[PDB]
Amino acid sequence: SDQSVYAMVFTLLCSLGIVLCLVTSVTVEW
Description:
Subcellular location: Cell membrane
Transmembrane segments: 5-30
Family: Belongs to the ABC transporter superfamily. ABCC family. Conjugate transporter (TC 3.A.1.208) subfamily.
Subunit structure: Forms an heterooctamer with KCNJ11; four ABCC8/SUR1 molecules interact with one KCNJ11 homotetramer.
Order of helices and strands: H
Oligomer: part of a larger assembly
Shape: rod-shaped
Organism: Mesocricetus auratus (Golden hamster)
Distance between the termini: 43 Å
């Protein structure tokens, strides 16, 4: 490439990735 929509979708996908990293890291050690 509005850039605000790109930043919003990028932030949402980053936050979902952080949560999924937490779930994977907990589940393997469990």
